[PDB]
């Protein structure tokens, strides 16, 4: 059971990092769309 709990902790810390990577991808997508708007308005 300790090994299983260790495996769950390891998996969740890695899953939280995967989410952080998608969060950062989202930030870059927002910058891309803002760049499209800024181009169109210029």
């Amino acid at each position: 059971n300790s090994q299983a709990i260790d495996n769950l902790r390891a998996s969740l810390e890695t899953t939280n990092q995967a989410i952080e990577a998608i969060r950062q991808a989202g930030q870059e997508m927002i910058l891309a769309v803002q760049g499209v708007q800024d181009y169109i308005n210029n």
Binding site: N7, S11, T15, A18, I19, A25, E28, M29, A32, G35
Partner: protein
């Protein structure tokens, strides 16, 4: 002349790279769960 065109490829390319990082990290989480 490139300034005559729209180029948001730096931001898109950064997003693509981070979605690839996420996929690696999810595959690792799945492998640890399966193990």
């Amino acid at each position: 002349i490139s300034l005559e065109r729209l180029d948001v490829g730096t931001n898109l390319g950064n997003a693509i790279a981070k979605l690839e990082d996420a996929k690696e990290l999810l595959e690792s989480s799945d492998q640890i769960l399966r193990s």
